Design a protein around this ligand. Structure first.
Ligand SMILES: NC(=O)C1=CN([C@@H]2O[C@H](COP(=O)(O)OP(=O)(O)OC[C@H]3O[C@@H](n4cnc5c(N)ncnc54)[C@H](O)[C@@H]3O)[C@@H](O)[C@H]2O)C=CC1
Ligand SMILES: NC(=O)C1=CN([C@@H]2O[C@H](COP(=O)(O)OP(=O)(O)OC[C@H]3O[C@@H](n4cnc5c(N)ncnc54)[C@H](O)[C@@H]3O)[C@@H](O)[C@H]2O)C=CC1
Ligand SMILES: NC(=O)C1=CN([C@@H]2O[C@H](COP(=O)(O)OP(=O)(O)OC[C@H]3O[C@@H](n4cnc5c(N)ncnc54)[C@H](O)[C@@H]3O)[C@@H](O)[C@H]2O)C=CC1
Ligand SMILES: NC[C@H]1O[C@H](O[C@H]2[C@H](O)[C@@H](O[C@H]3O[C@H](CO)[C@@H](O)[C@H](N)[C@H]3O)[C@H](N)C[C@@H]2N)[C@H](O)[C@@H](O)[C@@H]1O
Ligand SMILES: O=C([O-])C(=O)[O-]
Ligand SMILES: O=C([O-])C(=O)[O-]
Ligand SMILES: O=C([O-])C(=O)[O-]
Ligand SMILES: O=C([O-])C(=O)[O-]
Lengths: 331, 331, 331, 331
């Protein structure tokens, strides 16, 4: 008999449907950072990777598998064919178009739409019950696009949104105050990147509102120029890109944190991009970041942050601009 | 008063006295895989990064800092100047050229010896009591080089060695038997390279020797071709490099594994590059992998594996190859 | 409008079942050590507790719940009624009388069988697909009883068995060798109790056979008296009982280690109580520890350990001692 | 000659002085819950236990040691003599009388002062540079006593304080709001006991002030009776004590949480017992919980909370009750 049969007496065969499966789509730097972060937090019992680039895909799989001894995720698989993603609880999309010399925000989004029209139906075919976490940029528009193509109810389509923006805000807040980011509390909401909104009113340490100690916080009337902290959040991605080519590590950690809440049904509150029609005067099918309760069903609830009229008008303006673009798309 | 002063009453102005500081030298694929692995395993209270490409360096540091919210490593610093590395307990050298598709690690040696002549004096200046963990290829030769340039005693100069080769081996064993790598035991010793030695006599599950069950194990007349598993270990780096252009994740996890044992004083046994003059008839200052006890003072002890005379010969043959290259180097 | 209404907007009313639910029956010393160990290892999304002592049950539940902020298991419940236990993946049984100073574990059979006749049918009614993990003593006999009462197939009824004895053995081996127990390999099989069998032939560090180095190992005229190491393993519970009254922490951790393999489908090998009819000359339905591959379907496979004729005779003796007790049961 | 020497070739004899040693004094329910929580969080490379009852102490030590295989804390030691405590970074004092069912923690003062008169000088003799973490009740008063007796600067004498009371408060908040405690922020300050102070004005989810949404929050006329939540917090220990005899798991986890900030130098904010003379109108050497930044040097800073004058008067009353007792004590 074979060595294996001499060593091992089998009791039964027949596998079970995978219980805690995560899929990552796109094995570029962002996707791989999400993968390694997920593996190191033991969030999945199986991890599938999918991309069109067959060699890199396989290479990344192999390199992760070679580290199996040091992990507690016993099945890692990959393939260009989406059958490898079947029965995933959570599917993380990082795939997208790359920008060139110019050219047009509309053009850029349209090329992602085209890429999504292939990816999204493939994902829903094999994991009809999954939650979709959209990480690709521009994330708020692309969460809309994934929602539209999947036909998934809004609770199961989530955009990473201002999750990383807020964690960046808390880091920079921590640097200034000499306090770990965990104990610095602060929310950046609305549209990811340029037009995000720093909610100065919720900024606190140990429940002490920075705005109470310092009423002019964040305005042009404060000597400490905390507005600069929000600018840095907006600008920090551009600087990292300029310096190393791209962002990856912070997005990976940020995403694993969302995955943790989802996979473990924690019901923690995260700033993620969600369909906000009917909130803040918004009447269009648009996704923006507000604080959401994350769990086994995706977004079960959201928190209604009291915004000033200025803050509401910023979110409304963002919604208008996003809808302006989405209205012109074809799928 | 500044907002910070209104919020926070200072009791003491502390010092910058890190207790468990790790420095990673070189922030390419391998360096950053080592860094994220370390960060996600809470092995350090301070992470220092060093490189000669300053924009890359700053960008990688910033990207890690933006994830501080999701970490428990409160200080992450970097710089081209080695003063940021001061008082490191562990310094991990990942700097230098890497093998391209189809290229031997031994072909990297002149390029990387030059960069070790720059790096090593600068690390010893600012962390004279650190342990050196050498990752750059050819890792065995460069462990000797680091040992020689540093003037450190041999216990504090450790090459990542065959910790990875043995991990890969156990993964492949695992795939063949349907058993998790944790419960598959087997050792690859010698060069981290083409002349590595698979110790067939030591391979086991639950302490039952595979060689005893299957006397033709790893031989030519092996119908099951277990020699192909070791071949696959040998070829694994090249296969991953052919597919994705480099290896990173598996070595990142191997290095973290080694770091864990050192920083937590675990006294686990790892196959790491060490000075083996006096064993197996070797009488030159050759470094290569044999199982070592790893802890707070680096390698405290060597395990003496019972090798066959063929295995012992392989190891000697490998030793003489490495000494052939090292003898011509000057410092 | 309630505070909750004003603060939170609800999308999803329904609540899907818990995906990774564990139940611990018996909230005495062992039950709670299992509980805390499992909670700190993030192995469950829901933890259910059962006991016949209502006060103590509720008190223990509340004490854990108060620590929720520091855990990642969002639902902790209890009741004397087994409806709280429904849809459990894993049900760990720790209820029953414990041996006092000097008392054999086997002296507990009549008392703990009678308790099992009430507990097991209730567990099965509410979690028909669960894996049963038996900890109550005598654990080997009670696993047999749990198998017979439940009507479950043998793969899904596991006794904690010699996972603990083996951990103790490796600790003691470690203390003697100056090596972490992780790197010391030695197996103790058969009864979790006085007739346990140390497999000397399999003891190793880095795959090097201690027995081969030391032919007297485990013999009476061994100058180093290694039989004393196995003696200490046999005696360990008795010593701990006489010092603090009972054992809890170590079994807590051993149980969590088993639950980890089961809940995460790791396919690691553990010596656990299982039906070994048909090996080592055993013709009856004896349960005792042999190495088993442990995963999502419980015990999927047994490792056939190659015992010396003395080792096998001791193991056969162990099976005879156990069947002698089993043989006269009523349920 | 020995098996050990045939197996292992030694390089170094020198060793000793762990980097991250923690001592727990008192191995009753609280001490051992701290111990297991600390071990499972890998906060220490050595753990020392002390108690006056020698058999109990050895039994608890041995039980933990038997689980060594499952932990990454390679040295666990105990003794009645404080020499085993030498060189601790952190010493946790749990030894003392515990309150009976109908009993104030403040009724324990004389008994536990007596105990600290013996314990503290012995602790400081062997670890003059440790941080003291006081858990024994009444924790605030005994933190003052520890500070007085030891001669340590106030930054290095820390009471577990309201870290637990706040966790309970957040758990109960989470239950009412359908949200994980991590995302529910509310602070209970002052005495770890009956005069604790709920900071209604700082309570929030995602930076949204609950008091502004619901102005009667915390008042008598509140239709939702939120004041009942703080009543539950005050009564929680007595309720748990009535049900199971004592509290252990939540304080263990809370203490582990404090230990993690200290040992890893995180500079997170925690409500812990410290000397609050000079603030909130308090002019005496009272120790009470306020939010403090915890790190490598203990309490490096404290956060001044902008209490409402109603909230401030309650804290002042807590200060007055505690001073009434403090001022009578004999050294
Ligand atoms: N021991 C092992 O098993 C493995 C070793 N390696 C080796 O690790 C090394 C690095 O590989 P990668 O990170 O993929 O290469 P990489 O090109 O991505 O990064 C190398 C880094 O070293 C830096 N560097 C060069 N000279 C330097 C100096 N004087 N001081 C500081 N930094 C300097 C470069 O600027 C670059 O950032 C290679 O030699 C590779 O073969 C890679 C995988 C596994
Ligand atoms: N397999 C192993 O290695 C180990 C086994 N043990 C065994 O574990 C068992 C438990 O020991 P401890 O927790 O120390 O005892 P304990 O007396 O502290 O707790 C046992 C609990 O089981 C409960 N119980 C009794 N009848 C019950 C029923 N019909 N349904 C539900 N709960 C019931 C009791 O109310 C009690 O709370 C004993 O048989 C002991 O000998 C203990 C240590 C290690
Ligand atoms: N701060 C907090 O939130 C909490 C505080 N506690 C308090 O912690 C203390 C311990 O409670 P348990 O552990 O439940 O009590 P316990 O009775 O289980 O343990 C007390 C231990 O202290 C030891 N001890 C007594 N005098 C000693 C001395 N002179 N030297 C060394 N050891 C000595 C005893 O031998 C005993 O093992 C009590 O004061 C209790 O009220 C308890 C829960 C929470
Ligand atoms: N035939 C199958 C399908 O294959 C592609 O799907 C892939 C995307 O193309 C990838 O993204 C690409 O975008 C760049 C634009 O510059 C390209 O150059 C480059 N090759 C890629 O990186 C993305 N990461 C993964 C995704 N699975 C097409 O989109 C799709 O229409 C077509 O039906
Ligand atoms: O979206 C991004 O790439 C980012 O913010 O890092
Ligand atoms: O050294 C290498 O490149 C490897 O083995 O991954
Ligand atoms: O069975 C027991 O009590 C033990 O071994 O701890
Ligand atoms: O102090 C106590 O006993 C408590 O609150 O658990």
């Amino acid at each position: 008999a074979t060595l294996k049969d001499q060593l091992i007496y089998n009791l039964l065969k027949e596998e079970q449907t995978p219980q805690n499966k995560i899929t990552v789509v796109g094995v570029g730097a962002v996707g791989m950072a999400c993968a390694i972060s997920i593996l190191m937090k033991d969030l999945a019992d199986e991890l599938a990777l999918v991309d069109v680039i067959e060699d890199k895909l396989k290479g990344e799989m192999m390199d992760l598998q070679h580290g199996s001894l040091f992990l507690r995720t016993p099945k890692i698989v990959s393939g260009k064919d989406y059958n490898v993603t079947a029965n995933s609880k959570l599917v993380i999309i990082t795939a997208g178009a790359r920008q060139q010399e110019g050219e047009s925000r509309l053009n850029l989004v349209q090329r992602n739409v085209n890429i999504f029209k292939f990816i999204i139906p493939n994902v829903v075919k094999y994991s009809p019950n999954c939650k979709l976490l959209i990480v690709s940029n521009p994330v708020d528009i692309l969460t809309y696009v994934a929602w539209k193509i999947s036909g998934f109810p809004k609770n199961r389509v989530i955009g990473s949104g201002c999750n990383l923006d807020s964690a960046r805000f808390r880091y920079l807040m921590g640097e200034r105050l000499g306090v770990h980011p965990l104990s610095c509390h602060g929310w950046v909401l609305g549209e990811h990147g340029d037009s995000s909104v720093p909610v100065w009113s919720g900024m606190n340490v140990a429940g002490v509102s920075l705005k109470t100690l310092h009423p002019d916080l964040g305005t042009d009337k404060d000597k400490e120029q905390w507005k600069e902290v929000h600018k840095q959040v907006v600008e920090s991605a551009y600087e990292v890109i300029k310096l190393k080519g791209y962002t990856s590590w912070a997005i990976g950690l940020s995403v694993a944190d969302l995955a943790e809440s989802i996979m473990k049904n924690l019901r923690r509150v995260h700033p993620v991009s969600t369909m906000i029609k009917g909130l803040y005067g918004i009447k269009d099918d648009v996704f923006l970041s507000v604080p959401c309760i994350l769990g086994q069903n995706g977004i079960s609830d959201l928190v209604k942050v009291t915004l000033t009229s200025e803050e509401e008008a910023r979110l409304k303006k963002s919604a208008d601009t996003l809808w302006g673009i989405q209205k012109e798309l074809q799928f």
